[PDB]
Amino acid sequence: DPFQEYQKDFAYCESIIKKNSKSFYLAFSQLPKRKAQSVYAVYAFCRRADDLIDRDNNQAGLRQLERQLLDFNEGKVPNDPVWRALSVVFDNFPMVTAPFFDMLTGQRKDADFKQPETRKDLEEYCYYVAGSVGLMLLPLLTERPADIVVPAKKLGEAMQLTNILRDVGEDYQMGRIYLTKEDMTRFGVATTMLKEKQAQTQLVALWESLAKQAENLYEESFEMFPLITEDCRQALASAAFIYREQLNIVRKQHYSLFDNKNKVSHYRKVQLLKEVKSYLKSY
Ligand SMILES: CC(C)=CCC/C(C)=C/CC/C(C)=C/CSP(=O)(O)OP(=O)(O)O
Ligand SMILES: CC(C)=CCC/C(C)=C/CC/C(C)=C/CSP(=O)(O)OP(=O)(O)O
Ligand SMILES: [Mg+2]
Ligand SMILES: [Mg+2]
Ligand SMILES: [Mg+2]
């Protein structure tokens, strides 16, 4: 039983998601155990690639990670907890390495940050760092991932846009602007507005424009539900509804640009799980 054989490796991954994403841990913990542990392994790989760049600015770390993935792709499993847990997942489900490579390519681009010029640019980037994650997970969630790659990529995009909209102030502080040059021009936002406590009128317009796009993408992605394995629906919809709720938080705090993380209460998460359970009955 490979989940017993590699139980410490899966425990290693579980602890990583538990400590880093209370939201995705709560949402995905509703999966049957082996599928949930498989998600945690994938989370671990993602979290490691991202922390390397965003926290550590360690391009040499990200190179090592790329070399391990190339080996893994060849069939030579790196002797490393995350890679050993991933080998079990790849043994058990029709996982594919392509979106894992896409994630590293997106991370590497963040290592030399440029503001997107267009929404097209921003949309390609959201694929590499977020839509790819949907593709990593699909084989855990549906009998044929190819059937629903489009809506899966949309949910990853909706989430990444939500992350962007949540973190405008902290990002700018760090030297990053994800909002598009074209949007800033269209809505008459000056980058100076990005360091204030509450969004000015122009930035609220832009914020809401992008939030509407995210909200549309969430809704569009929900088209995949009928092809999602029944026992996986509550967990996946939970992840979506919990993440989407952060848009309403920023609105309720009157478009605060800072301190928007960890603002969805446990109470509100529980409410959302029940909403999700009601919502799914309509499939
Ligand atoms: C498998 C699964 C359910 C989830 C994997 C999610 C992860 C960790 C993906 C790595 C890259 C991303 C999208 C990081 C968060 S956006 P950010 O880097 O701007 O924000 P942050 O400050 O790191 O939260
Ligand atoms: C499953 C599927 C078909 C589509 C969804 C794909 C997923 C899960 C994309 C992850 C995107 C993001 C922004 C994750 C935040 S990771 P975090 O741990 O840093 O939490 P935080 O950034 O702090 O919100
Ligand atoms: Mg990042
Ligand atoms: Mg990060
Ligand atoms: Mg971010």
TrEMBL record:
Record-listed Mg(2+) 2 binding positions: 163, 167
A GO MF term: metal ion binding
Binding site for Mg(2+) 1: 50, 54
Pfam families on file: SQS_PSY
InterPro entries according to UniProt: Isoprenoid_synthase_dom_sf, Squ/phyt_synthse, Trans_IPPS_bact-type, Trans_IPPS_HH
Superkingdom as given in the UniProt entry: Bacteria
Keywords assigned by UniProt, alphabetized: Metal-binding
GO aspect biological process, one term: terpenoid biosynthetic process
Protein's name according to its UniProt entry: Phytoene synthase
Originating species: Enterococcus hirae (strain ATCC 9790 / DSM 20160 / JCM 8729 / LMG 6399 / NBRC 3181 / NCIMB 6459 / NCDO 1258 / NCTC 12367 / WDCM 00089 / R)
